[PDB]
Amino acid sequence: DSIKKTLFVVIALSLVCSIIVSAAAVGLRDKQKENAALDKQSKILQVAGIEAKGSKQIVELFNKSIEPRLVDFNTGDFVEGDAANYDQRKAAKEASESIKLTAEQDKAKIQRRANVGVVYLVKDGDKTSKVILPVHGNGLWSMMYAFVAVETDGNTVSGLTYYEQGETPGLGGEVENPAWRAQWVGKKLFDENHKPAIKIVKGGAPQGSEHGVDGLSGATLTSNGVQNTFDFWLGDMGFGPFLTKVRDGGL
Amino acid sequence: MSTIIFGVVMFTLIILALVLVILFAKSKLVPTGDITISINGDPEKAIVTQPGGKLLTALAGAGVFVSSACGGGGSCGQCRVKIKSGGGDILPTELDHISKGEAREGERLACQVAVKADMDLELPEEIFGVKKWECTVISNDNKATFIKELKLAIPDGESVPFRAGGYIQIEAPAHHVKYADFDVPEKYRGDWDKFNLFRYESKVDEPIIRAYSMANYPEEFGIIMLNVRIATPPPNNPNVPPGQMSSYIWSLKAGDKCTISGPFGEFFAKDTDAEMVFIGGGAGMAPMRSHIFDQLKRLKSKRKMSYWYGARSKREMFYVEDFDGLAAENDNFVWHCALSDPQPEDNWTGYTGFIHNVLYENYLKDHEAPEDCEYYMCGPPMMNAAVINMLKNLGVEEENILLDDFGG
Amino acid sequence: MEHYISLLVKSIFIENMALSFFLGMCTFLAVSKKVKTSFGLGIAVIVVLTISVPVNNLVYNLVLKPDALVEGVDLSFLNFITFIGVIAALVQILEMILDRFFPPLYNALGIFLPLITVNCAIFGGVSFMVQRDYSFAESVVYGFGSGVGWMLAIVALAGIREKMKYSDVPPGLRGLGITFITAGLMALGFMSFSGVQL
Amino acid sequence: GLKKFLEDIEHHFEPGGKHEKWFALYEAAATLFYTPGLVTKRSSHVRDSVDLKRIMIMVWLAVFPAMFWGMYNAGGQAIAALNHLYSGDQLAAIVAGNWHYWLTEMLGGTMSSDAGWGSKMLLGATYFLPIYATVFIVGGFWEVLFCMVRKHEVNEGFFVTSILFALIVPPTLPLWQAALGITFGVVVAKEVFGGTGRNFLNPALAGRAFLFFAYPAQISGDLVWTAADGYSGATALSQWAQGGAGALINNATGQTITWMDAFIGNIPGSIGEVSTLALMIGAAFIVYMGIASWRIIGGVMIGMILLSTLFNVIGSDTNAMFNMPWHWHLVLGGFAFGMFFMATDPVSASFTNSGKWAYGILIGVMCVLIRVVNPAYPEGMMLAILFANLFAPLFDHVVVERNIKRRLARYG
Amino acid sequence: MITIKKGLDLPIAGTPSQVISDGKAIKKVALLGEEYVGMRPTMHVRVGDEVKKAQILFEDKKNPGVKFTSPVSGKVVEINRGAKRVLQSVVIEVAGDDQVTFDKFEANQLASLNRDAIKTQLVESGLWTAFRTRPFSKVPAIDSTSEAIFVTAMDTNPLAAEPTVVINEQSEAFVAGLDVLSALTTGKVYVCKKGTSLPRSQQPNVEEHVFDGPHPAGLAGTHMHFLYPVSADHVAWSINYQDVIAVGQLFLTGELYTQRVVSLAGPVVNKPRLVRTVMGASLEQLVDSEIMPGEVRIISGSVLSGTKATGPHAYLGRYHLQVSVLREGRDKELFGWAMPGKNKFSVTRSFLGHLFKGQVYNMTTTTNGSDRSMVPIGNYEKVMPLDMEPTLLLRDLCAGDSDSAVRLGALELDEEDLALCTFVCPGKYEYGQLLRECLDKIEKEG
Amino acid sequence: LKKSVLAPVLDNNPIALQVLGVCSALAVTTKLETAFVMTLAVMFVTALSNFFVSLIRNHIPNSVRIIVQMAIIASLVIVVDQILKAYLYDISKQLSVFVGLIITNCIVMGRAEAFAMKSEPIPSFIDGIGNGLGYGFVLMTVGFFRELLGSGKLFGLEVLPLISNGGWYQPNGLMLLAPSAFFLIGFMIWAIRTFKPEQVEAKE
Ligand SMILES: Cc1cc2nc3c(=O)[nH]c(=O)nc-3n(C[C@H](O)[C@H](O)[C@H](O)COP(=O)(O)OP(=O)(O)OC[C@H]3O[C@@H](n4cnc5c(N)ncnc54)[C@H](O)[C@@H]3O)c2cc1C
Ligand SMILES: Cc1cc2nc3c(=O)[nH]c(=O)nc-3n(C[C@H](O)[C@H](O)[C@H](O)COP(=O)(O)O)c2cc1C
Ligand SMILES: CC(C)=CCC/C(C)=C/CC/C(C)=C/Cc1c(C)[nH]c2ccccc2c1=O
Ligand code: FES
Ligand code: FES
Ligand SMILES: [Ca+2]
């Protein structure tokens, strides 16, 4: 009785528990994915300067106004693919679709870059108003991710948002301060030579400067990370070629 | 849909594989065999146990009974045994109680020796001689406002080989009791009616067992006397129900019969030929009478003995005839009594107050060498503590003090 | 081999399971009364973690990853049940294989060996291994290092508590509260490794 | 007459007196002025002259040179920075707006670049003294409260605790933050364990760590180490990391920090840490008297030198802290202050001669390790000491177990 | 040759001149009941009873068969008792010369006498109480034996008498006592001494050992630690040189020998010197007209480990060979804890006194401070020459952790061994009492 | 009778007396939202697991009783985790690994073994609810102070205006780190055992 009853009890309990667990797990995948997508869409709309309250409005406006696209970093022109679901973070891990940088190339200290990245085009009908570029780099405590919206001239920033960072709330966490993110509106990424020109200034930027942005107060080790990420992703190994194309066409 | 089938199948397979692995490992890593116990002398009366039985329970099933105060487990630690082999480690559950003693010879409580090993056991002789008897009540009469004397006739004309000051155990089945059935004499009805105690009732639905000391000494062959007090609800807390075994014994009458167990050995007097002092109060008359009679008549010794009893009132005296006769015929014995709370009908002119204070003021405060005497005491806790403190302030060492507790 | 040295050092110090992630606190606080018992429990935890993390890595990589079994199928929702079942089986096997049978050494722990299943440290370690996507050797090294770090923390706490025989703690704080405060103070000292990116 | 006055009011405080609850205060005040006048009741009928009062007063006196030089240096740094930034009417307006500055000028000092040592020390005092008074009063309140509630006599040690805590903070620390830090250090780390001689952590460093992790913006960065309004300037350890010996420039004066400047104490930083010469002069005394552990000091030095030389040998092409030699490690930051006065706390250290060496070596190793390979913080003495406090009892255990084995072998 | 490097020679003033002289007449002697650890007396005499020398006064309950006898012939005049009726003293007033007598032997038979005969003769005369047992410093049980008997032929206590001066007067008795011990022991007899010469016993199992260094070098505990480490399994007996002389006299002439030679010294003693007295002499009568005016404390034994001899305790102890006198210090000084002490002794270097080497101090009984917690500035390590962790052991004693103290080595110690640790404690702890409490717990529990 | 659901709150508090559930208390008490969600999840899991384990208490094979109990608990917590990911994604992202760790949370297994294995299903359910409330008491009390003094808000509502946005309060940075939880729990235990002396531990 012992062995037979033990096996019977375990089998029956496993059957019931597995039925419940599998049914519940398979019945909620769609909603879990919807929540995950809404989280990102809300931030993209926020940085794009479009307001949206509620999932229905977020989805409506994102579908109406945003057009994800894939870009090849080496050549800077658009490439075909499933941009709406492409996962750049995972794409960067695998050697099949990711390169490893060199000491003098890895200014942002990211250790790798995926071959193709996703950019979002903001549209006001059939025309394109601006491009949102996801960038990231290493801070003092964590890896910092941000969106930067560039206008159609390919030089002028219209917004910046850090949507993932783990710095100290009072010192390095100020990258998320609205008053500091508001300084980027109107700055120009490149100079008349078309070289990267964004400066993070320790002690504040000169009044009326079109390339300088105040550094974080008492957070030099994070201002350096911001400067490194920008001067990398604006270079030849990042969105440099793509922005060069944008400056005179392609978009 | 396919994911559901795969999830079900993999859940079941994983759980089943883990269970099967555990069972297979168990079948080879567990001894799964027989195990026995035996006295160190390896007599023919070996003991066979299941590998999952407690040592105390196994020994009780084998007939080797031991004292108990909780019906199982460790409550007081009186159930101690000696082990040579098998019991290769002592757990903190024996160091906690009773603490230390550093028994180099391997002593442990029998409530937690367990399990898997062929056990070598050593026990005292008294534990080998336990027997169970059925007795017939000769008399059951009141001698105080809450105390009876139960007299039992030993069956088949045999006499229990007990020692003065020892105790036996009574065993009774599940019973129900009501106090209106008691035949309380008119000498004690006043206080019962004062609190209307006849209204109380109690019951128990399992067999019960209790221990009692006997007021006789081994020269009174064939009969056992027990001074039993009835356990009533505390006067300040009438909420709780009364006791069971005392009520049952009070319910018994002459001609009835009850089943008892053999005696257990402890509280024996020392043989140092020193003066002995007995302090008693209330129900603690049985050990004192046993010791006094055994010392004076069976051993026929000339040691100096004195007995001091703290009585509530003259209405509560008994064995006065025996003690007076002993004090009148023997030049080496004397006995005194004091009334804790006398009442007018006593017409009392003797010692009053607590017995410890009486003894201090009259005998010990001017005694030559208190520490050289031996003190045997038994009574309520708030007499016992006072006596102990008094003796301590006189410098008496613990080895010369013997204290018996009925359980508070 | 410097990669594995870095991983081991990170696991022991820069990512101390007890005083950086704060897992296993129930036994960390209850059993740290004496250094010898703490050392025994730490050894047991080391063994269990080392045997557990690699096996769970194997099972996850073979049957639980997406497309691991059949293309287009994802059984990752069985992660918790698989992890806990493996851990429980391994510890129940340990109890029968070593402690109660050799040398024996069971009596030292008693109540505390069976409940190593619920030790949050092991489950958290396997969860972190899955999140980090280690190889087999990395899983072995990570498990060993995390167990060693947990043992280090518990032994240090036991040493402090033994040193506190001379203290005079308020009655309301004696025992559990003062131990909580002591662990809080230990956390401050262990915050020295925060900025290291090993 | 203080003697007979104290001896007359004595009866009001003994059990049953009208002031029985203030017995702790009465005893603390009376035995500060006069000695107890007691005799030996048993055992050894003659006793050593030393006592905890003298033990603590010697340590309290040992840091006076460091405190005075710290005040002078703080004043000089502040004045130099102010005159570097502002001039003329702008400087006058700046002075009129800060009570430190216009008090210094009211009491006969001058805030111009030609100020003397007197004015510089006065300006340093107007920063140091408020902090010290706040710390002293707030911590003494808690100590006396615990002693009254638990009905004990007030033990000694707070004199050392308060002064060290006041000396290991920047000159610009807010007073409410100082109060919170001392409250934490005294209550959580010392009093909850029974008081003096019964804790396991260092109270002053515990309070400093509380401040460090709770309000990092006021105890780190470029804005806190020089008491000049609007002045921003890094210090030596932060400069060496960004990096090399060529980055050590005193921007307020334009000169280059030299080893002698660092050794004497002409550099910004915590109030009392700067002067290695003064710290050594003070520590030599208490080491000679046998109150400080030369074994602990030697262990710290050994660990520091070993790890510094290892880093120097293996070298690095990116981290400039790999170049710093041991003699620069010695004079930069708060290494000397901690080594001499905070790593030698008898209660927090090991109780065995052979364990003290390991304790010191661990502290020395950890300090350099945090300085070099931890980019978050420029210095690591406080963290290293707090870390070694956790493992000192374990070294004691390791030593005592070997002793016990020797005993069991019938050779000890 | 063993050299002790860690210790302290206390530089107290009033050191005796090592020349023996007669003492003032003694008319009362007493036996002190509280100095025998673990003793519960049973009185065999009553006030007014006449006694003879070597007659039993009381017998121990907890150590059956051990007898304590009268040092002199007279009559009992007092039986002092204290709290909880503890016996303090049994006082006898000297009168007459009656005595009990025993057997006598030739000098060449002692080395071959029988062990049981030796034991019986020692027990009957009450001289069996000269021995003490490490651990627990109790009188040995009658039925027990020991492999190691330690003789202490050196004295390093401050103001102590020089053993060689006394021994040279009683060479034959000392050698006879050594011979008797050689037969009483089942192992070897260790004669611990300094570099100077002493009379020698010719028995193979009696051997001399030389110790050098500051004070702690002269203690039976140090000698045991270095020659025969003791524990629960291994037990050693200790006896001092004057008791050895007494044993030799006993077995040579058949009479109890109760003479003593003690040093009377101290800062307040006018003419420190060695004095001939009798066992249990009255210290009040002994130090009569020997001391300067003022309030003083009379101590039987060293200022390190003696007993305050006042009231019912004003008699020479059984195991004490000196008397010390010094002023009761009760002055209160302004900021005394902070002054630079040119006249203040200390084992540390915080006072100006240590700069004046060769200085001697008129020490008093002041406690230079108040009771406080223990801050380990490392003073204990400077005065403990044994292989132990003094700070850990002392904190175990303070905390009451008997089990840990036993592991750390408490069984090897006696109250005399922690006298210097008590001396140099900034917290003014008294460690002898704590050690005695821990040993009491350990002995009771097992 | 009510006492069975209220005793665990103060008389037999899990974290403060037993002691169980310390890990989640340390981890998830930096925001009242996460603390409250964890409290509810633990209540639900413990109550349901107690009910189900008691329902089949007479048939569990002694050999693998741990396996059976952990299977039930793991199934329940898996369902809870799926539901949280479906409907409370933002809070699930913050709870991270501690949702799964409910399986090894000592309270659930302790109650399942000690009580559910020897009691009727409805009493077991009530015991689970009471223990969950006792756990939530400590969780919410610690989270209150931590969140308030560390960020000036409760449940995300601004209560103390911050200086960084024009307010007057400067948040404490230590309240967002682990040691603050240890200190808070220690002082809470101190207060509880002051107001209920019977819980004071012996000297040694
Ligand atoms: C060695 C030994 C010798 C003894 N000798 C004698 C002897 O010679 N004579 C003698 O009379 N007895 C003797 N006793 C005592 C005896 O064994 C019984 O304890 C006694 O007789 C009472 O038994 P009972 O069954 O009547 O009461 P019990 O049922 O044991 O107790 C009932 C009493 O307890 C109260 N009570 C019950 N439950 C509670 C509760 N939850 N809270 C509070 N109060 C409660 C009841 O109100 C009542 O007062 C001896 C005991 C021992 C161990
Ligand atoms: C005893 C002591 C310990 C210190 N510990 C630390 C520390 O652990 N971390 C830290 O960043 N600064 C610490 N400091 C402060 C620095 O030593 C120094 O005063 C300050 O960082 C000045 O900047 P700099 O080091 O870049 O010159 C400590 C100071 C003292 C006196
Ligand atoms: C100070 C005074 C007049 C009264 C005490 C009342 C009070 C408010 C004290 C707060 C500071 C304090 C508790 C110091 C302890 C301590 C004392 C009292 N005397 C000391 C004396 C010498 C050396 C150290 C100490 C020491 O460290
Ligand atoms: S049966 Fe209860 S203690 Fe033995
Ligand atoms: S909740 Fe108990 S170990 Fe984590
Ligand atoms: Ca990328």
Q: What one-character-per-residue DSSP string does B322-340 give?
A: HHHHHHHH-TTEEEEEEES
B258: β partners? B135
Whole-number Cα distances in Å, E446 to B104, B234, E232, E357: 9, 41, 11, 50
Q: Which residue has the tokens 């911050």?
A: F162
- Domain termination residue (choose one: B89, B113, B129): B129
- Domain termination residue (choose one: B206, B231, B265): B265
CB F142: neighbour CB atoms within 10 A? Answer: 23
- D194, part of any domain: yes
Euclidean distance between CA atoms E219 and D42, whole angstroms: 20
Q: Is C77 on the interface with A (CB under 8 A)?
A: yes
E307: β partners? E300
Residues in CB range of A179: below 8 A, 6 or more apart: none
Pair D86, D210 in one domain: yes
Buried-exposed string F61-90: b where 16+ CB fall within 10 A, e elsewhere:
bebbebbbbbbbbbbbbbbbbbbbbbeebe
CB B21: neighbour CB atoms within 10 A? Answer: 14
Q: If you count them, how many residues does chain C have? A: 198
Residue B403 corresponds to which tokens in the numbers above? 């204290």
Q: What domain range is D1 assigned to?
A: 1-35
Asked if E31 contacts E129 with a C-beta cutoff of 8 angstroms, the reply is no
| Ligand 4 pocket member B7 (CB < 6 A) | no
Pair D188, D85 in one domain: yes
Burial of D70 (0-12, 13-18, 19+ CB in 10 A): buried
Among B306, B378, B361, B309, which Cα is nearest to B340's?
B309
User: Please, what is the Cα angle at B172 between B167 and B174, to 5 degrees?
Assistant: 145
Quickly name the fold that domain E23-97 has. Answer: OB fold (Dihydrolipoamide Acetyltransferase, E2P) (2.40.50)
Residue A181 corresponds to which tokens in the numbers above? 């993110």
Mutation for B interface: F60, F62, F67, most B CBs within 10 A: F67
Q: What separation in Å is there between the alpha carbon of A134 and the centre of ligand 6?
A: 9
- D380, part of any domain: yes
Q: Is D312 on the interface with A (CB under 8 A)?
A: no
A119: β partners? A69
Q: How many domains does chain D have?
A: 3
CB C158: neighbour CB atoms within 10 A? Answer: 25
Whether residues D47 and E367 touch (CB distance < 8 A) is answered with yes
- D193, part of any domain: yes
Mutation for A interface: B15, B21, B30, most A CBs within 10 A: B15
Whole-number Cα distances in Å, E369 to B98, D47, D52, E398, F162: 44, 9, 8, 19, 52
Residues in CB range of D42: below 8 A, 6 or more apart: E308, E430, E433
Q: Is A79 on the interface with F (CB under 8 A)?
A: no
Instruction: Please give, rounded to a whole number of angstroms, the shortest distance from the CA of B13 to a CA of chain A.
Output: 9
Euclidean distance between CA atoms B287 and C97, whole angstroms: 56
Residues in CB range of D37: below 8 A, 6 or more apart: E330, E331, E332, E366
**Residue E52: in which H helix or E strand, if any?**
none
Nearest by CB: A26 against B3, B11, B15 = B3
Asked if B279 contacts B260 with a C-beta cutoff of 8 angstroms, the reply is no
CB-side neighbour CA atoms (13 Å) of B273: 1
Residues in CB range of C138: below 8 A, 6 or more apart: C4, C7
State the chains in contact with A (3 or more Cβ–Cβ pairs under 8 Å).
B, C, D, F
Q: What separation in Å is there between the alpha carbon of E425 and the centre of ligand 3?
A: 21
Pair B179, B271 in one domain: no
Q: Kindly compute the dihedral angle of the four CA atoms of residues B373, B374, B378, B381, in this order, to the nearest 10 degrees.
A: 60
Asked if E364 contacts E329 with a C-beta cutoff of 8 angstroms, the reply is yes
CB C36: neighbour CB atoms within 10 A? Answer: 10
Whether residues D50 and E348 touch (CB distance < 8 A) is answered with yes
Resolution (A): 3.2
Residue B291 corresponds to which tokens in the numbers above? 């010791």
Q: What domain range is F101 assigned to?
A: 2-203
Euclidean distance between CA atoms C41 and C45, whole angstroms: 6
Q: What separation in Å is there between the alpha carbon of F20 and the centre of ligand 5?
A: 6
Residue E303 corresponds to which tokens in the numbers above? 């200022």
- Domain termination residue (choose one: D183, D218, D253): D218
Pair B341, B309 in one domain: yes
Collapsing DSSP states into helix, strand and coil, what is residue D412?
coil
> Sign of dihedral through CA atoms B366, B368, B371, B374?
negative
Ligand nearest to the CA of D208: 2
Which residues in chain B are contacts of F63 at CB distance < 8 A? 22-23, 26
Pair D106, D186 in one domain: yes
Pair D67, D30 in one domain: no
Q: What are the residues of chain B with a beta carbon less than 8 Å away from any beta carbon of chain C?
A: 2-3, 6-7, 10-11, 14-15, 18, 21-22, 25-26, 29-30, 89, 91
Domain ranges (residues) in chain E: 2-21+102-253, 23-97, 367-446
Residue A154 corresponds to which tokens in the numbers above? 């390919």
Binding residue per annotation — B79? yes
E87: β partners? E81
Buried-exposed string A107-132: b where 16+ CB fall within 10 A, e elsewhere:
bbebeebbebbbbbbbeeeeeebbbb
Asked if E161 contacts E14 with a C-beta cutoff of 8 angstroms, the reply is no
Q: What domain range is B174 assigned to?
A: 130-265
User: Please, what is the Cα angle at D6 between D1 and D7, to 5 degrees?
Assistant: 105
- B18, part of any domain: no
Collapsing DSSP states into helix, strand and coil, what is residue B55?
helix
CB B157: neighbour CB atoms within 10 A? Answer: 8
Q: How many domains does chain B have?
A: 3
Euclidean distance between CA atoms A90 and A84, whole angstroms: 15
Which residues in chain B are contacts of A14 at CB distance < 8 A? 11-12, 15-16
Euclidean distance between CA atoms F70 and D19, whole angstroms: 64
Asked if E439 contacts E417 with a C-beta cutoff of 8 angstroms, the reply is no
Residue D173 corresponds to which tokens in the numbers above? 């620390």
How many CB pairs below 8 A link B and E?
A: 22
Q: What domain range is C30 assigned to?
A: 1-198
- B11, part of any domain: no
Residue B86 corresponds to which tokens in the numbers above? 């098998």
Pair B147, B236 in one domain: yes
User: Please, what is the Cα angle at B158 between B157 and B161, to 5 degrees?
Assistant: 155
Residues in CB range of B67: below 8 A, 6 or more apart: B78, B79, B211, B264
CB B283: neighbour CB atoms within 10 A? Answer: 17
Residues in CB range of F151: below 8 A, 6 or more apart: A169, F162, F171, F175, F176
Q: Is D40 on the interface with E (CB under 8 A)?
A: yes
Residue E281 corresponds to which tokens in the numbers above? 């002499």
- B328, part of any domain: yes
- Alpha-helical runs (H) found in E149-305: 163-167, 171-184, 220-227, 241-253, 283-286
Pair D66, D28 in one domain: no
Q: Is E233 on the interface with B (CB under 8 A)?
A: no
Q: What one-character-per-residue DSSP string does D112-124 give?
A: STT--HHHHHHHH
Q: How many domains does chain C have?
A: 1
Among E417, E416, E425, which Cα is nearest to E348's?
E425
Collapsing DSSP states into helix, strand and coil, what is residue A93?
helix
CB-side neighbour CA atoms (13 Å) of E110: 28
Residue F21 corresponds to which tokens in the numbers above? 């559930």
